[PDB]
Coordinates of C-alpha atoms and ligand atoms in Angstrom, one line a residue:
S1 CA 0.0 0.0 0.0
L2 CA 1.0 3.7 -0.4
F3 CA 1.1 3.8 3.4
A4 CA 3.7 1.1 3.6
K5 CA 5.6 2.5 0.6
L6 CA 5.9 5.9 2.3
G7 CA 7.6 4.4 5.3
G8 CA 4.7 3.3 7.5
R9 CA 3.7 4.6 10.9
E10 CA 7.0 6.5 11.5
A11 CA 7.1 8.2 8.1
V12 CA 3.5 9.3 8.2
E13 CA 3.9 10.6 11.8
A14 CA 6.8 12.7 10.7
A15 CA 4.9 13.9 7.6
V16 CA 1.8 14.9 9.6
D17 CA 4.0 16.7 12.2
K18 CA 6.2 18.6 9.8
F19 CA 3.0 19.3 7.7
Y20 CA 1.2 21.0 10.6
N21 CA 4.3 23.1 11.5
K22 CA 3.8 24.7 8.1
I23 CA 0.0 25.0 8.5
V24 CA 0.2 27.3 11.5
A25 CA 3.0 29.3 9.9
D26 CA 0.9 30.1 6.9
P27 CA -1.6 33.0 7.4
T28 CA -3.5 31.7 4.4
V29 CA -4.8 28.8 6.6
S30 CA -3.4 29.2 10.1
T31 CA -6.4 31.1 11.3
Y32 CA -8.7 28.2 10.7
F33 CA -6.8 26.3 13.4
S34 CA -6.7 29.1 16.0
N35 CA -9.2 27.2 18.2
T36 CA -7.8 23.8 17.5
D37 CA -5.6 21.4 19.5
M38 CA -2.7 20.9 17.0
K39 CA -1.7 17.7 18.8
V40 CA -5.2 16.3 18.6
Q41 CA -5.3 17.5 15.0
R42 CA -2.0 15.6 14.4
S43 CA -3.7 12.5 15.8
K44 CA -6.8 12.8 13.6
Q45 CA -4.9 13.6 10.4
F46 CA -2.6 10.5 10.8
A47 CA -5.6 8.3 11.4
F48 CA -7.4 9.5 8.3
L49 CA -4.3 9.6 6.1
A50 CA -3.4 6.1 7.3
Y51 CA -6.8 4.9 6.2
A52 CA -6.8 7.0 3.0
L53 CA -3.2 5.8 2.2
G54 CA -4.3 2.2 2.7
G55 CA -2.6 1.7 6.1
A56 CA -5.8 1.3 8.1
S57 CA -9.1 -0.4 7.3
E58 CA -11.4 2.2 8.8
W59 CA -11.9 5.9 9.3
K60 CA -14.0 6.6 12.4
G61 CA -13.8 10.4 12.5
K62 CA -16.0 12.9 10.7
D63 CA -16.5 12.7 7.0
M64 CA -14.5 15.3 5.1
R65 CA -17.6 17.3 4.1
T66 CA -19.0 17.4 7.6
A67 CA -15.5 18.3 8.9
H68 CA -14.9 21.5 6.9
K69 CA -18.2 22.6 5.5
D70 CA -19.0 25.0 8.3
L71 CA -15.6 26.6 8.5
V72 CA -15.4 30.3 7.8
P73 CA -14.7 31.9 5.6
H74 CA -15.9 29.1 3.3
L75 CA -13.1 27.0 2.0
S76 CA -12.1 27.6 -1.6
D77 CA -9.4 26.3 -4.0
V78 CA -6.9 28.8 -2.5
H79 CA -7.0 27.0 0.8
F80 CA -7.1 23.6 -0.7
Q81 CA -4.1 24.3 -3.0
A82 CA -2.2 25.7 0.0
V83 CA -2.8 22.5 2.0
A84 CA -1.8 20.4 -1.0
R85 CA 1.3 22.4 -1.6
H86 CA 2.3 22.1 2.1
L87 CA 2.0 18.3 2.1
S88 CA 3.9 18.0 -1.2
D89 CA 6.6 20.2 0.3
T90 CA 6.5 18.2 3.5
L91 CA 7.1 14.8 1.7
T92 CA 9.7 16.3 -0.6
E93 CA 11.7 17.4 2.5
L94 CA 11.2 14.0 4.1
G95 CA 13.0 12.3 1.2
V96 CA 10.0 10.7 -0.6
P97 CA 10.5 9.5 -4.2
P98 CA 8.7 11.9 -6.5
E99 CA 6.6 9.1 -7.9
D100 CA 5.4 8.4 -4.4
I101 CA 4.6 12.1 -3.9
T102 CA 2.5 11.8 -7.1
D103 CA 0.4 9.0 -5.6
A104 CA -0.1 10.7 -2.2
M105 CA -1.1 14.0 -3.9
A106 CA -3.6 12.0 -5.9
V107 CA -5.1 10.6 -2.8
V108 CA -5.3 14.0 -1.2
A109 CA -6.8 15.5 -4.4
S110 CA -9.5 12.8 -4.4
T111 CA -11.0 14.4 -1.3
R112 CA -11.4 17.9 -3.0
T113 CA -15.2 17.8 -3.7
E114 CA -16.3 16.8 -0.2
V115 CA -13.6 18.8 1.7
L116 CA -14.6 21.9 -0.2
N117 CA -18.3 21.3 0.3
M118 CA -18.8 21.5 -3.4
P119 CA -21.7 20.2 -5.6
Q120 CA -21.1 16.5 -6.6
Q121 CA -22.2 17.4 -10.0
Ligands
HEM1 C1 -7.0 19.1 1.6 C2 -7.4 17.9 2.1 C3 -7.8 17.8 3.6 C4 -7.8 16.7 4.3 C5 -7.4 15.3 3.8 C6 -8.1 17.1 5.7 C7 -8.3 16.3 6.8 C8 -8.9 16.6 7.9 C9 -9.3 15.7 9.0 C10 -8.9 14.2 9.1 C11 -9.9 16.4 9.9 C12 -10.5 15.8 11.3 C13 -12.0 15.8 11.2 C14 -12.6 15.1 12.4 O1 -12.8 15.9 13.4 O2 -12.8 13.9 12.4 C15 -10.1 17.8 9.5 C16 -10.7 18.8 10.2 C17 -10.4 20.1 10.0 N1 -9.8 20.7 8.9 FE1 -9.0 19.6 7.3 N2 -8.4 18.5 5.7 C18 -8.2 19.0 4.4 C19 -8.3 20.3 4.0 C20 -8.4 21.4 4.9 C21 -8.3 22.8 4.6 C22 -8.0 23.3 3.2 C23 -8.5 23.5 5.7 C24 -8.4 25.0 5.8 C25 -7.6 25.7 5.1 C26 -8.7 22.6 6.8 C27 -9.0 22.9 8.1 C28 -9.6 22.1 9.0 C29 -10.1 22.5 10.3 C30 -10.1 23.9 10.9 C31 -10.6 21.2 11.0 C32 -11.3 21.0 12.4 C33 -10.3 21.5 13.4 C34 -10.9 21.3 14.8 O3 -11.8 20.4 14.9 O4 -10.6 22.1 15.7 N3 -8.7 21.3 6.2 N4 -9.4 17.8 8.3
CYN2 C1 -6.2 20.1 7.9 N1 -6.6 19.3 8.7
XE3 XE1 5.9 10.2 4.4
XE4 XE1 1.5 11.4 4.1
XE5 XE1 0.7 15.1 5.6
XE6 XE1 -3.7 16.6 4.1

């Protein structure tokens, strides 16, 4: 699985950690997390990514749409692209093969419609 390919528990823990260090340092998105526990958020993101990356069989948290839909200001592609870029940058700095970054980005991108509370067409 992508999860195992990336390096497993340890790699993903490092990615999520370094990823969120960028999140709070970016005024484009940091404000959304002002009232958030960033350690709990680290926990949740790992659990979801692990599932999304094929490392876990279940995701028990909130569905992406429910999770972000009521955030203000309404999430657009400016925030989604920032988050994507931050993860890409994260993995690149963690020494991940570019082809692996391609697959992980694809998994993250596949959550666009729900995360952005957009019409399913
Ligand atoms: C791009 C793909 C994204 C993924 C895969 C993702 C993943 C997650 C996950 C797993 C949660 C936990 C939900 C729960 O409570 O079970 C969450 C919540 C949250 N997300 Fe995201 N997210 C994404 C995009 C974004 C973006 C673009 C923003 C804003 C710029 C954002 C801000 C937040 C906030 C503020 C929460 C709730 C924090 C809290 O409960 O205090 N997310 N997201
Ligand atoms: C972003 N969680
Ligand atoms: Xe990773
Ligand atoms: Xe990741
Ligand atoms: Xe990440
Ligand atoms: Xe993410």
